[PDB]
């Protein structure tokens, strides 16, 4: 929101007070408390008739410094709070000197200047990475609406860019944007978002989480041009500065703090498939479609049932439409008879037309208005009511229906909607409606995730969630949303996926979204993502088959990268800036991305096939075209529909499977490793994972002089090692040699080989 | 202004209607008129009881297509209106088939789809560069405030970035930002701007001017992520799509259309110096301050007097403070006797304390409220009032005061304010207060500029203007405002200067308190390597070094300044403008091109670390002479007398033989510098005369290892340095000698040939 | 569409409330046995019109406010108009009257609807060249055949009309207090009065 009016004035009707001078520094165990006056209070006769700010510094995790700025403490401060993991014994140091008051956790410290010239600085090993200059934080008394706010403005450095704030579709870099963290169903082509996260990162190696579930208004370089401003309707403001010299280290700390992405089941990384909305007429039409996929040798691994598996206007009362699906479990078992996994559509609302509606109304499981009447409106469904998830009995009832569905054989759920949560309501537990709005996305998905964790097992739990909130990354695979059939929308989509990754979410799915050429280009992008769903000519079939097979082969690689998201919070689809923080040329790249640690992907956004992309320093190799390009610059290429820039970094050792028909299989058996530009004095390591994500086998290829020493440790049989762009060598100690299109294929005998170039 | 609420809803209280179906297309000499219904109207019945949009397509000139979309024509629609140059005889073709209605001017055309699927597309030789999709333009009846708006959303393609919208200090690329073109005094570090221009440009080679002086609210990819939305409180909306395959071409058409930047005098490119806002206490505290300058051999060319030459609280009654400057005229002559040009501070407001206030009030020369009382407030000056430049006699009174200053010896004026123009007033000529707010900036600077033209001569006219509006680029040298003393602020300032250039302004000056010495030193390099520089012990060395460099660069710099006047190509150019084809240049904003061939990257650190991008080619540092190959970024460290200044290859640069001033005979003793001339290439260099016309051309063409140097025009005692060439094995019609930068050749006339 | 602040009773008298602005009547609707009338005004004027019988009341009332004129006999004939917007041309209206000629249905007066003018320009008195190329020709042909003709007209004008700008420049259209034109999109786009 607008607080200032240019640098010399305040917006009409706003009264501001700021922490201008330190009055007293106190130490309460593991925390530091600073009391600051909004005016000069050095003379005792002035130590009265003035407000006083209370700044409390604490650390919930190593390297994370929390700041709580308080005006009044007498406020109710109810509602739900974010699911943060707070430690009590974090090692920190507090130094209260003549000129400063410094609090430190890890290499990150918060320092406040005493005497004249107030200042709040965040230091890394004594170097300022950001901070709040005098008069840049404080209390806002709005006399126009009689509401009060707290605000802070953290400095931005020269060339410092901002990322995150959830899954957004506006320009990747947030500088210049106003952002309201408030879940809304506005599509994927506007400033609104289904998944808002009051967390942002910069290319300077730190992150920030504004710990408030209610709406937080960010002005990122949009009011004060070189500052990230944030305000919230509250009597106190609390935020956490998260260090990690590197963006990746920030995500590590951030996810450890708010929730680690779970590792989805290998079978979920396959091609999901749903029939055109409203065409699921019956079992036959569904089988005719699935058979059509097989008749054209198109791998299908997951089938999804849209909204119409239930009767119209009574959506999510969990009653199958008799006139459509007479025998639910019979049809599901028949479908699963074939490898197929099953997913069905659901949401947290319920139409009045449903026979179950009256029942729930009587039991009181639906969200009510303060007067006891049901909260209702006609958006989405007629007389639509909302399941009150603050009521244990409503949760139980909802979960039970889900278990009923799992018992029939459904494997996962597409948790749709969940954004439009009203505030003119009264929750069963008396939560603050302003905070419940966003957090509702969390409880709703948490409830569904626990059902799968209790029926199919945590390792098997997968979801397709459209809404999110802090901590919701723990319930994997968030779906991108709508998307129209044009290139600009496809580009918008990518920015959204990239942004969610920069927000702590490790997995992202979207639909292969109407000119045939657009569809075909989107295919490559779709399959070259962590999760992809095919929604609804003959070349089109070649394209789907091609990349579906391609993805299945990349699983040994893909899945290990997926384990990284669960362990470190490193999303699989990564913005270029995250992987090459120190490269100035990567700051704004939003049309390409790293798929895992070593693969650069650049979807093409033209019918002709023209595409431009940048490659950081090094010599890259196309995954299958095998051509080489030098880095630190941009490139222009023209690709057919069965191609796109997919380059592999140098000094790389990739792991590809011998199965291009499915995602889930024995990756360490018959696995084919590929070595890419291993430089003299470099070692390329490769870790093939086990179905559970653990490292089952480790291959290493070190180069000294012109001698390559490949050594394997773990469990793997009948594997091969292909030296890319190496037609022939003159020294193969302990192994067999062969020729291929991509290079010299070495067949070993024992995990220990040596090759002289 | 938020119109939609997500992709599925509309903001509460808004009733929208859009042009959904073409009903009729009528041609009317040079203009194509399209009537569009807000609903299906094919059947004769139902061809009533419905609103109707009237779309008029016209061309004010070649390559510019105007679009006026109106609801009601019965509104007052009072002026002022932008000072557009509207040619009446432009060659255009109207093609009205039964599938499309198309209006064309040059290579640009506007096409409307007939039938069931409405569409408004803008084509460049048949290819779409942008357009408006159905329901992305129309009328907004806002029942909340009882106001009505017109809006349009022009498509943005994949990777298409937006630039411009005036001198703004937010991120350079506008995507994601909301912008209100309304002049304000908000400093240089907020979303506000002193110089608002409802014109924007993209990296796709076209521009758009929204023809409305009142506030235009832009949602640049901030409402509809891939569209530039703009709305205005009006019963009609008019905008101009401006073709220009390349950004420079867009700016050429745009400046020809709204005004060409004038050519400032060479002496204005020197170093300006001002009195600290709290220092000019006497005629001596200054008369002696400029000596300290001389003593340390610091070339100073223009001296500026701040607000305090007048008595406090009486600001801008034009009266010299008797207790401070007893003899203004005598003091000015002494300053001019030291080779200084003189500039004084002025503004369009007047404090009530001034003995003149009473006089202006009685004559009715001050802006009044509707009841006839005076409009006043206490901001800036106590009981401050505004000169009503819409009142002829008030203009003359103000002008006569200005003429009085020129008579005393003042050479130019710093037109300082003009932003906070109230709207709850009644202008003498009955202008619409909403449109007058911004346009006042124009009227005010036009008045002052014309006085100079009438007194010192058009070629001697120069200003330091803080405020601006469309067309005001015609009154050269707009000042970037006051910046805080830090690096982040320095960066913000540059974005502003780059943005104003992307907005039609060809010149831009900025200032170089309590700033750490290092920041101050880095800023000096930036300051002098700009169009115009104003200043305000190693720091002396830096100021001296860079002033001397700028003076040496004048033969090249001034020719570039003539480019601005002739083609509207700003001197300080955004990398994107100079290299539209390069992807790596879309977001570059911490570096720039100073004229056609010099890349400047200011360093924003004490340690001297700096990172910059260089386009394809082999570049040479202006004075270090080291080379770097482009198409990638570079990292370097520079001391305080250095920073990245790289010369493009295949360029012939003219440097002068005088480092003490900017105004001298450039074509005499001129030292030419040839930088990496490739085989099969030709490098041309035009040295200008004082009036900006080319007075001598030097050309170096290479074939094999033979470089043919040919020159025409007047110039003498010139030389040619072959940068990084140790020696040649063949020189015809010339002498040679070694040099730090490389072998220097002396001609025997002006037609020598060299063999590498 | 036609309001008249005058009423009569079965007791042989009438009452005219003399106010052109809105008069509000509560006829036995507030006070069941009284005719109540009110008006925004600083004075009230009404006329009690006698005449033992209803006819004598109307005699006096029409004498007082205006006698109905006597229309020409031919107007008492059978007026004819085509379906709205079906007058596609001269040939179309002829074949229509000729269809009347046969079947022996006497046709005395023909009426031209709104569409004799251009759509959205209604009542700029401008014939639509695409439909009726020769207006005077067609009229004389319809007449000179026994037919009297009537044409549709109204006191409003749509903005699309080429004469709108003229009427606007001459100041002939109803204006708001601030001098701008009064307009709205009901009946005709940018309709003026």
Short mmCIF file of C-alpha atoms in Angstrom, two decimals, chain C:
data_model
loop_
_atom_site.label_atom_id
_atom_site.label_comp_id
_atom_site.label_asym_id
_atom_site.label_seq_id
_atom_site.Cartn_x
_atom_site.Cartn_y
_atom_site.Cartn_z
CA UNK C 1 -47.09 7.91 -22.52
CA UNK C 2 -49.92 10.43 -22.22
CA UNK C 3 -50.54 11.90 -18.76
CA UNK C 4 -53.21 14.50 -18.03
CA UNK C 5 -53.76 15.86 -14.49
CA UNK C 6 -57.52 15.96 -15.11
CA UNK C 7 -60.23 13.61 -13.85
CA UNK C 8 -64.02 13.18 -13.99
CA UNK C 9 -66.51 11.44 -11.74
CA UNK C 10 -69.89 9.81 -12.17
CA UNK C 11 -71.29 12.81 -10.27
CA UNK C 12 -71.05 15.19 -13.23
CA UNK C 13 -67.97 17.33 -12.61
CA UNK C 14 -64.30 17.42 -13.47
CA UNK C 15 -61.10 18.68 -11.90
CA UNK C 16 -57.97 19.99 -13.63
CA UNK C 17 -54.85 20.38 -11.47
CA UNK C 18 -52.99 23.14 -13.27
CA UNK C 19 -49.36 22.03 -12.99
CA UNK C 20 -47.21 20.74 -15.90
CA UNK C 21 -44.66 19.21 -13.51
CA UNK C 22 -45.39 15.87 -11.84
CA UNK C 23 -48.69 15.85 -9.98
CA UNK C 24 -49.10 12.98 -7.53
CA UNK C 25 -52.62 11.58 -7.21
CA UNK C 26 -53.84 9.26 -4.49
CA UNK C 27 -57.36 8.44 -5.76
CA UNK C 28 -58.97 6.84 -2.72
CA UNK C 29 -55.55 5.21 -2.22
CA UNK C 30 -54.49 7.07 0.96
CA UNK C 31 -57.85 8.45 2.09
CA UNK C 32 -60.32 5.97 0.61
CA UNK C 33 -63.08 8.53 0.04
CA UNK C 34 -61.07 11.42 -1.37
CA UNK C 35 -59.03 12.28 -4.42
CA UNK C 36 -55.72 13.57 -3.12
CA UNK C 37 -53.30 15.53 -5.30
CA UNK C 38 -49.96 17.06 -4.37
CA UNK C 39 -47.24 18.89 -6.26
CA UNK C 40 -43.77 20.29 -5.55
CA UNK C 41 -44.73 23.95 -5.57
CA UNK C 42 -45.21 27.00 -3.38
CA UNK C 43 -48.80 27.26 -4.63
CA UNK C 44 -51.54 24.95 -5.82
CA UNK C 45 -54.07 25.73 -8.52
CA UNK C 46 -56.88 23.55 -9.79
CA UNK C 47 -60.15 23.94 -11.63
CA UNK C 48 -63.51 22.42 -10.78
CA UNK C 49 -65.37 21.99 -14.07
CA UNK C 50 -69.13 21.59 -13.88
CA UNK C 51 -71.56 20.21 -16.42
CA UNK C 52 -74.35 18.07 -14.93
CA UNK C 53 -73.31 15.30 -17.32
CA UNK C 54 -69.90 13.83 -18.33
CA UNK C 55 -70.40 15.22 -21.83
CA UNK C 56 -70.92 18.77 -20.59
CA UNK C 57 -67.76 18.45 -18.47
CA UNK C 58 -65.71 17.44 -21.51
CA UNK C 59 -67.35 20.21 -23.53
CA UNK C 60 -66.17 22.83 -21.02
CA UNK C 61 -62.81 21.15 -20.47
CA UNK C 62 -61.96 21.02 -24.18
CA UNK C 63 -63.22 24.59 -24.62
CA UNK C 64 -60.91 25.59 -21.75
CA UNK C 65 -57.87 23.58 -22.81
CA UNK C 66 -58.42 22.90 -26.52
CA UNK C 67 -60.87 21.48 -29.02
CA UNK C 68 -59.87 18.29 -30.83
CA UNK C 69 -59.38 19.15 -34.51
CA UNK C 70 -61.46 17.34 -37.15
CA UNK C 71 -59.24 14.88 -39.05
CA UNK C 72 -59.64 14.43 -42.84
CA UNK C 73 -62.01 11.62 -43.86
CA UNK C 74 -59.30 9.63 -45.64
CA UNK C 75 -57.46 9.21 -42.32
CA UNK C 76 -60.45 7.20 -41.11
CA UNK C 77 -59.44 4.56 -43.60
CA UNK C 78 -57.38 1.45 -42.95
CA UNK C 79 -53.77 2.44 -42.27
CA UNK C 80 -51.11 -0.07 -43.19
CA UNK C 81 -47.52 -0.65 -42.13
CA UNK C 82 -45.19 -3.55 -42.79
CA UNK C 83 -43.49 -5.72 -40.18
CA UNK C 84 -40.77 -3.70 -38.45
CA UNK C 85 -37.55 -3.54 -40.54
CA UNK C 86 -39.00 -5.49 -43.49
CA UNK C 87 -39.12 -2.50 -45.85
CA UNK C 88 -36.11 -3.65 -47.86
CA UNK C 89 -36.85 -1.43 -50.86
CA UNK C 90 -39.40 0.17 -53.15
CA UNK C 91 -40.23 -3.09 -54.91
CA UNK C 92 -40.85 -4.77 -51.55
CA UNK C 93 -43.51 -2.27 -50.39
CA UNK C 94 -45.21 -2.32 -53.79
CA UNK C 95 -45.56 -6.09 -54.01
CA UNK C 96 -47.02 -5.68 -50.53
CA UNK C 97 -49.68 -3.14 -51.49
CA UNK C 98 -50.35 -5.19 -54.63
CA UNK C 99 -50.90 -8.20 -52.40
CA UNK C 100 -53.51 -5.98 -50.77
CA UNK C 101 -54.98 -4.98 -54.14
CA UNK C 102 -55.67 -8.65 -54.74
CA UNK C 103 -57.67 -10.29 -51.92
CA UNK C 104 -59.52 -6.99 -52.36
CA UNK C 105 -58.41 -5.40 -49.10
CA UNK C 106 -58.84 -1.60 -49.44
CA UNK C 107 -55.58 0.21 -48.59
CA UNK C 108 -55.90 3.97 -48.03
CA UNK C 109 -52.86 5.07 -46.04
CA UNK C 110 -49.38 3.53 -46.04
CA UNK C 111 -46.87 4.09 -43.24
CA UNK C 112 -43.07 4.07 -43.37
CA UNK C 113 -41.35 2.91 -40.17
CA UNK C 114 -38.08 3.95 -38.53
CA UNK C 115 -35.94 2.19 -41.11
CA UNK C 116 -36.68 4.68 -43.88
CA UNK C 117 -33.65 6.35 -42.29
CA UNK C 118 -30.22 4.93 -41.44
CA UNK C 119 -29.92 2.88 -38.24
CA UNK C 120 -28.47 4.63 -35.18
CA UNK C 121 -29.05 7.97 -36.95
CA UNK C 122 -32.76 7.97 -36.27
CA UNK C 123 -34.41 11.18 -37.11
CA UNK C 124 -31.95 13.29 -38.97
CA UNK C 125 -34.61 13.18 -41.71
CA UNK C 126 -32.11 11.48 -43.99
CA UNK C 127 -33.43 8.77 -46.31
CA UNK C 128 -31.33 5.60 -46.53
CA UNK C 129 -29.91 5.47 -50.12
CA UNK C 130 -29.30 1.72 -49.83
CA UNK C 131 -32.97 1.00 -49.22
CA UNK C 132 -34.82 3.87 -50.87
CA UNK C 133 -32.55 5.28 -53.63
CA UNK C 134 -35.35 7.40 -55.12
CA UNK C 135 -37.50 8.81 -52.29
CA UNK C 136 -39.55 11.40 -54.19
CA UNK C 137 -40.05 8.99 -57.07
CA UNK C 138 -41.35 6.23 -54.82
CA UNK C 139 -43.63 8.59 -52.89
CA UNK C 140 -45.25 9.98 -56.04
CA UNK C 141 -45.72 6.43 -57.33
CA UNK C 142 -47.41 5.30 -54.09
CA UNK C 143 -49.59 8.39 -54.23
CA UNK C 144 -50.95 8.99 -57.72
CA UNK C 145 -52.50 5.60 -56.99
CA UNK C 146 -54.94 6.75 -54.33
CA UNK C 147 -52.62 6.27 -51.36
CA UNK C 148 -51.87 8.89 -48.71
CA UNK C 149 -48.56 8.27 -46.95
CA UNK C 150 -47.30 8.72 -43.41
CA UNK C 151 -43.71 8.74 -42.18
CA UNK C 152 -42.25 7.94 -38.77
CA UNK C 153 -40.38 10.71 -36.91
CA UNK C 154 -39.30 11.63 -33.37
CA UNK C 155 -37.65 14.48 -31.42
CA UNK C 156 -34.32 12.72 -30.85
CA UNK C 157 -31.19 12.22 -32.93
CA UNK C 158 -28.52 9.52 -32.80
CA UNK C 159 -24.87 10.55 -32.73
CA UNK C 160 -23.98 8.56 -35.86
CA UNK C 161 -26.00 10.98 -38.02
CA UNK C 162 -23.77 13.24 -40.15
CA UNK C 163 -25.99 16.13 -39.18
CA UNK C 164 -25.44 15.54 -35.47
CA UNK C 165 -22.18 17.50 -35.49
CA UNK C 166 -24.02 20.37 -37.21
CA UNK C 167 -26.87 20.50 -34.70
CA UNK C 168 -24.21 20.34 -32.00
CA UNK C 169 -22.26 23.25 -33.50
CA UNK C 170 -25.43 25.35 -33.96
CA UNK C 171 -26.46 24.66 -30.35
CA UNK C 172 -29.80 23.07 -31.31
CA UNK C 173 -29.63 20.04 -28.98
CA UNK C 174 -30.66 19.89 -25.29
CA UNK C 175 -27.68 20.79 -23.11
CA UNK C 176 -26.61 20.21 -19.52
CA UNK C 177 -26.08 23.22 -17.23
CA UNK C 178 -22.34 23.14 -18.01
CA UNK C 179 -22.94 23.61 -21.74
CA UNK C 180 -22.17 20.05 -22.86
CA UNK C 181 -24.72 17.88 -24.64
CA UNK C 182 -27.15 15.69 -22.74
CA UNK C 183 -26.89 12.12 -24.07
CA UNK C 184 -27.48 8.44 -23.22
CA UNK C 185 -27.56 5.12 -25.07
CA UNK C 186 -31.26 4.39 -24.80
CA UNK C 187 -33.13 3.99 -28.10
CA UNK C 188 -30.20 5.37 -30.11
CA UNK C 189 -26.41 5.49 -29.52
CA UNK C 190 -25.34 8.84 -28.08
CA UNK C 191 -28.92 9.99 -28.44
CA UNK C 192 -29.52 13.73 -28.17
CA UNK C 193 -32.73 15.77 -27.98
#
